[PDB]
Write a protein that binds this ligand. Structure first.
Ligand SMILES: CCCCCCCCCCCCC/C=C/[C@@H](O)[C@H](CO)NC(=O)CCCCCCCCCCCCCCCCCCCCCCC
Ligand SMILES: Cc1ncc(COP(=O)(O)O)c(C=O)c1O
Lengths: 14, 481, 69, 555, 182
């Protein structure tokens, strides 16, 4: 889930 | 997602430079000023007296309309210098010594430099003479009130003002940006009702922090000329917990046994009755400037946050030294306030006792005022000009509200011309110069009517004033008929 | 064309009036002192706060030296 | 002992006083006759910057100060509310002022309050006499001894050195005191007018180059009460972002909509004009009834000018109006002292309203407004200060007339050009020497306002106190007045200062700025592009001949 | 008894409410002068100082000796709380602006005269998330620290700065008190 949260955060940054 | 949209319409396209250019080229602005009625109003400039190579003393030599009229040895009754202590030889010597030891200007604002020891000495003398703790000096009286009052009020405070206050106070209220209420001009019942309603609403609203509260009035009114009730005001502001702001420009040096203002007239203490006092060094003290009397906290905050104080140059040193000398002279062996009081009493009795004029004019000033005002008995005004004060007020207020560029009112102009005719007759026939109340009616925002004005000072022989009163009386009677 | 003004000599002139390497040691010491003092807001604070701040910076420097050693 | 004393004047035989107030010229090569610009606009400013660590240190300093100030406020009000009775309620009466809207004043300027508002005495001329004070408990209150000492003046507005007490104007003032009075009757529209007022108005109108003019007794009041008279709430005003406070007060009191543009940016001004013409009034989109552009001749915190040619072009192209405030420009700039119209060769007819003050370069008090004829007649009928406020006294008018005649070359013809050339040389010399030593200096070459940048909140009290210890009087400004990241000292150069005084000041400034780490000039502020750290003797020797060439001034 | 000039401040009569838009005079007063309170943000070195304060905090907490996870969580929480206190708590200006004209806006809403999603607002949004990503690699094996840090971040450093919470005031009884709407 950690990689999932980090991917979500990258998406929201974009 | 599709079902939860909002049904808009495709937006229009952005204008291309050429559309902007043609729309800009179509626009037509108006002239800066309005030249439409510069000709039918410009008699005021043509009828203003101009004294030459002489001080503005009791007997003057004037001219009107660009050296096209001349009058000599005219009796002067339009000067605001009531005490005439500033022309005496000791004050002249002090002025000359100050000018030789200092320059003529200060060259800098109070913040940096250019605040000499003479300024501090004058502030101490003013505070000690009037009774308060401290005071501050201002460049001119007209800019004192609109600078002080916005420093102590803002969006969220309440001001309760009289029904007819002078223009500087109106400017201060407008620029203060607070809630303003008007009471009924020396109707203590109306003031008490308004304060009671306000305080009950505040108690119901249960605000976290209570706001600032001021009562705004004047000592001797600028236009009307009638006294203000200080005992009732102090009593009920103590009861309802407000602060009192008194603008007494025409009473300092005119009211009291020693001319110490309104409080000495009513036998109170100024440090406990009035919170802010705005004065003038240009009417009774025969100089230039203004001042504000308060306590230490208020004075310090003025030195920090009052705009006209910190963004304008200090006033010349000869003015402050002359005022200090005048205060010392007024402290020892006055005789001048006393003479002024007797003369003013006789003048008011003269124009109030007559009955032959009791159908055309009325006397508005109180017996303690040093200036006498007259009006036109609204019956006569209606009968001869066909307009009442009320409709004039709503006319001008309506013009201001929609902001029409050209604001010209004909009946008022005709009445003004009639009053100037009354002045002209007396000047030309009897060699007596009285004045007209000079207002700019497109700027006022409270009801006002044109009027006359007769001033007195402390350097006239009573018999000469009596004869002058007789002459003015005959002039009014002759013109009115 | 004399006036009523009193002139004050430059510090170099004062040193020349008053005349080993100890002076250079003193000057470098005061150079470091002045840099440290002026680049932090010590003229704008009080005395209590100033002292507290001093203690704070000395502690950080001492602990950094402790860690590096 | 706690109240400022009333100090006594000295004997000082006449020669000593004359030298005290106005330094006698020593060389004929220390003058400079300025030229015009023949309509050329101003080249894009090349303002310099310091290294990054200075900016970062400033940010840290302010952060620390704010944190401690707020902590002190909270603790003191909550616990020790016994000794904070002036910030708290008392018997159902709100306090005079709130403690948060005066945070900066107390918490940051009550520790350096001895650098502002220094008492003085005598004539504010070449050498100013200061009264010394001893400060108690970190400037809580001051106490005064009887000592008085002279310092070199670099703080008061005395551009042409007319602030003296032994000139011809002072004699004019004395004769006016003898002849007319020190007292005025009342307002101008009632009894207050004399023939002296008429003569002054005519002479001012002739001097400026317009058709008519008025004179008032205060400059702040003039600006505050003009726009009220001739504007309304359906008109728009475009004002520069660095305008004086009196303009803002006067515009605020009228009602008109206001928009501001960035300082010294003309493409933005044109864009804003076009956009606001297209948009129209808010909430109705009706056409604007009127558009007025306000500006200043010389901004006296930056030392820069206004692009007058481009302003005239834009106003003629889009049919706007122009208003110029020449408080620091008139009398002290131009080949003959006429202001910015003289500088740029612009005809003083394209500018609708000109206003200025007699306070700065004429050694007097008051203000004026000059425009075309019909405008002046309408305003005289319409303005408020004409009818409601007292007229200006006779000695001030006499001094103003005398100084205007002196500059105009009508009386004692040698003095006017002497003063103009002296000030023009002194300003250039000081600016060039300071930039060669290694400081950062703002403004155009000929400006008499010379701001020197400090950049750190703790370097300002130190600089002021060190200079005062070395007998020099200076002025400093801080965050609420100037941008957060740039605090400066501004020098005001007079025409009464001799080159010897400037050399003395240069040596002391070089030493102090060497000790306080202030020389941080880059190569962006030299005509070559190489950073400069010259020696004091070399720059002193080589500057006086070089400051005349319009080649070493990047600005 | 009706006022000629209505310049009176109302209070929220609900639980969730928005500050009322300003009238003509209020807009003129706000636009008459460049705001000295929120103009320093765009000048030289502001972004760099936001970076530098974090490094200083990290060095301090590392000086306190504790393990990497503790130092990094302390750094994150300290920076987030400090930023919230400075930019989102106090409303008004620390000096007299005008009739007051900003008495009910925080410093965050005053930036760039209430223009949203400007480059500076974007930078100040990006900083908290990247700071969390950097610190994520050290206390990742503790559920409690990870959850608490993520909660503090998303709830204090990203929500107040969102474009939908603009001019949003929450007024509960007994803690916040009646907010100011007019
Ligand atoms: C009892 C313990 C309580 C906790 C300690 C005390 C904290 C409470 C004091 C702080 C209250 C602040 C209130 C509001 C302050 C500002 O908004 C004011 C009013 O708007 N603005 C101004 O004055 C205008 C701006 C002036 C310049 C300020 C900026 C200076 C440089 C700061 C750059 C930003 C720094 C990084 C963002 C903030 C991080 C804060 C980290 C805190 C910990 C590290 C420093 C100790
Ligand atoms: C641009 C400007 N306007 C007006 C004034 C008013 O000056 P004073 O207060 O000396 O009349 C000053 C100073 C100024 O710099």
């Amino acid at each position: 889930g950690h990689f999932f949260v980090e991917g979500l955060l990258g998406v929201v940054i974009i | 997602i599709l079902l939860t949209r909002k049904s808009y319409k495709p937006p229009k396209r952005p204008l291309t430079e050429q559309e902007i250019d043609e729309l800009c080229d179509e626009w037509v602005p108006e002239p800066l000023v309005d030249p439409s009625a510069t000709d039918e109003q410009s008699w005021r400039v043509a009828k203003t007296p101009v004294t030459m190579e002489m001080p503005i003393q009791n007997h003057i030599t004037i001219t009107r309309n660009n050296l096209q009229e001349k009058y000599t040895n005219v009796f002067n009754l339009a000067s605001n210098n009531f005490l005439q202590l500033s022309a005496t030889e000791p004050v002249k010597e002090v002025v000359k010594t100050t000018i030789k030891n200092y320059g003529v200007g200060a060259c800098g604002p109070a913040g940096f430099y250019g605040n000499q020891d003479v300024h501090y000495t004058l502030e101490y003398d003013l505070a000690q003479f009037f009774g308060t703790q401290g005071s501050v000096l201002y460049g001119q009286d007209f800019c004192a009130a609109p600078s002080v009052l916005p420093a102590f009020t803002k969006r969220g405070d309440v001001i309760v003002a009289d029904d007819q206050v002078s223009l500087p106070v109106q400017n201060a209220l407008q620029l203060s940006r607070s809630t303003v209420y008007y009471f009924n001009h020396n109707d203590m019942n109306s003031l008490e009702c308004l304060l009671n309603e306000l305080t009950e609403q505040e108690k119901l609203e249960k605000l976290p922090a209570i706001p600032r509260k001021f009562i705004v009035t004047e000592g001797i009114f600028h236009n009307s000329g009638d006294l203000a009730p200080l005992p009732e005001l102090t009593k009920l502001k103590n009861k309802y917990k407000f602060r009192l702001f008194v603008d007494e420009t025409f009473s300092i040096g005119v009211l009291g046994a020693t001319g110490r203002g309104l409080s000495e007239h009513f036998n109170m203490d100024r440090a406990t009755a009035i919170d802010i006092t705005v004065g003038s060094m240009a009417t009774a003290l025969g100089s230039t400037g203004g001042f504000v009397l308060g306590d230490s906290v208020m004075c310090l905050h003025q030195r920090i946050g009052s705009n006209a104080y910190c963004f304008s140059a200090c006033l010349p040193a000869y003015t402050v030294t002359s005022v200090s000398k005048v205060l010392k002279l007024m402290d020892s062996n006055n005789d001048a306030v006393q003479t002024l009081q007797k003369l003013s009493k006789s003048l008011h009795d003269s124009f109030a006792s007559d009955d032959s004029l009791r159908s055309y004019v009325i006397v508005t000033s109180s017996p303690v005022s040093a200036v006498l005002h007259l009006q036109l008995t609204p019956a006569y005004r209606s009968r001869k000009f066909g307009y009442t004060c009320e409709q004039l007020f709503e006319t001008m207020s309506a013009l201001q509200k929609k902001s029409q560029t050209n604001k010209f009112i004909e009946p008022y102009e005709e009445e003004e011309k009639f009053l100037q005719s009354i002045v002209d007759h007396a000047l030309i026939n009897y060699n007596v110069l009285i004045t007209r109340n000079t207002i700019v009616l497109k700027q006022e925002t409270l009801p006002i009517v044109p009027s006359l004005k007769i001033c007195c000072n402390a350097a006239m022989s009573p018999e000469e004033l009596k004869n002058a009163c007789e002459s003015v009386k005959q002039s009014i009677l002759a013109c009115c008929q | 064309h004399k006036s009523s003004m009193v002139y004050i000599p430059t510090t170099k002139e004062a040193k020349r009036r008053n005349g080993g390497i100890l002076n250079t040691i003193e000057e470098v010491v005061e150079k470091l002192y002045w840099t440290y003092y002026i680049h932090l807001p010590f003229y704008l604070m009080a005395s209590f706060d100033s002292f507290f701040l001093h203690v704070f910076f000395l502690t950080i420097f001492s602990l950094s030296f402790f860690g590096i050693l | 002992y706690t109240r400022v004393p009333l100090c006594e004047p000295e004997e000082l035989p006449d020669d000593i006083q004359k030298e005290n107030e106005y330094g006698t010229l020593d060389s004929p090569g220390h003058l400079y006759q300025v030229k015009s610009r023949h309509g050329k606009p101003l080249p894009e400013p090349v303002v310099d910057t310091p290294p990054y660590y200075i900016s970062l240190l400033t940010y840290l300093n302010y952060l620390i100060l704010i944190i401690l100030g707020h902590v002190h406020d909270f603790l003191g009000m909550t616990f020790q509310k016994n000794k904070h009775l002036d910030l708290l309620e008392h018997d159902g009466l709100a306090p005079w002022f709130s403690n948060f809207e005066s945070f900066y004043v107390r918490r940051i300027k009550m520790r350096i309050d001895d650098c502002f508002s220094r008492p003085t005495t005598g004539v504010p001329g070449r050498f100013i006499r200061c009264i010394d004070r001893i400060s108690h408990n970190i400037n809580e209150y001051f106490t005064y001894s009887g000592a008085v000492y002279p310092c070199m003046n670099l703080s008061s507005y005395n551009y042409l050195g007319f602030a003296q007490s032994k000139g011809q104007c002072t004699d004019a003032a004395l004769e006016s005191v003898d002849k007319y009075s020190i007292q005025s009757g009342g307002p101008r529209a009632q009894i207050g007018t004399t023939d002296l007022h008429i003569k002054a108005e005519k002479l001012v109108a002739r001097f400026i180059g317009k058709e008519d003019a008025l004179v008032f007794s205060m400059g702040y009041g003039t600006n505050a009460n003009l726009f009220n008279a001739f504007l309304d709430k359906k008109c728009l005003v475009i004002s520069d972002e660095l305008n004086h406070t009196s303009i803002r007060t006067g515009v605020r009191l009228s009602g008109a909509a206001v928009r501001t543009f960035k300082h010294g940016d003309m493409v933005g001004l044109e864009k804003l004009i076009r956009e606001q013409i297209v948009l129209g009034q808010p909430k109705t989109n009706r056409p604007w009834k009127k558009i007025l552009i306000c500006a200043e001749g010389l901004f006296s915190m930056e030392g820069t000018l206004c692009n007058l040619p481009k302003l005239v072009e834009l106003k003629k192209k889009y049919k706007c109006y122009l208003f110029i405030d020449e408080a620091h420009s008139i009398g002290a700039m131009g080949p003959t002292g006429r202001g910015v119209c003289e500088i740029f060769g612009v005809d003083p007819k394209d500018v609708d309203i000109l206003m200025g003050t007699f306070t700065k370069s004429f050694g007097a008090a008051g203000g004026y407004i000059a425009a075309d004829q019909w405008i002046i007649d309408r305003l005289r009928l319409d303005l408020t200060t004409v009818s409601y406020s007292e007229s200006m006294p006779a000695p001030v008018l006499a001094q103003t007339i005398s100084s205007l005649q002196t500059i105009s070359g009508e009386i004692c013809p040698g003095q006017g050009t002497e003063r103009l050339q002296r000030i023009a040389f002194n300003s250039r010399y000081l600016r060039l020497a300071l930039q060669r030593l290694g400081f950062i200096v703002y403004g155009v070459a000929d400006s008499p306002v010379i701001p020197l940048l400090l950049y750190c909140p703790s370097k300002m009290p130190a600089f002021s106190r060190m200079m005062l210890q070395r007998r020099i009087a200076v002025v400093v400004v801080a965050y609420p007045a100037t941008p957060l990241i740039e605090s400066r000292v501004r020098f005001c150069m007079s025409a009464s200062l001799t080159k010897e005084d400037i050399d003395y000041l240069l040596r002391h400034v070089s030493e102090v700025g060497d000790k306080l780490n202030l020389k941080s000039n880059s190569g962006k502020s030299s005509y070559d592009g190489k950073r400069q750290r010259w020696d004091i003797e070399e720059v002193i020797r080589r500057t006086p001949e070089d400051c005349k060439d319009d080649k070493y001034f990047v600005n | 008894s009706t006022p000629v000039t209505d310049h009176r401040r109302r209070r929220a009569a609900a639980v969730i409410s928005h500050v009322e838009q300003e009238t003509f005079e209020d807009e003129n007063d706000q636009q008459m002068l460049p705001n000295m309170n929120a103009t320093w943000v765009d000048q030289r070195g502001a972004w760099l100082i936001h970076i530098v304060v974090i490094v200083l905090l990290r060095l301090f907490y590392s000086l306190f000796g504790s393990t990497p996870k503790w130092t990094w969580t302390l750094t994150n929480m300290t920076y987030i709380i400090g930023f919230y206190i400075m930019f989102h708590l106090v409303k008004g200006t620390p000096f007299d602006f005008n009739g007051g004209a900003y008495d009910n806006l925080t410093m965050w809403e005053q930036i760039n005269d209430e223009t949203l999603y400007t480059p500076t607002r974007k930078f100040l949004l990006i900083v908290p998330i990247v700071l969390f990503l950097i610190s994520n690699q050290y206390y990742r094996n503790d559920m409690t620290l990870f959850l608490s840090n993520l909660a503090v971040t998303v709830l204090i450093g990203v929500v107040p700065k969102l474009g939908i919470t603009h001019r949003l005031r929450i007024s509960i009884p007994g803690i916040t008190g009646r907010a100011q709407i007019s």
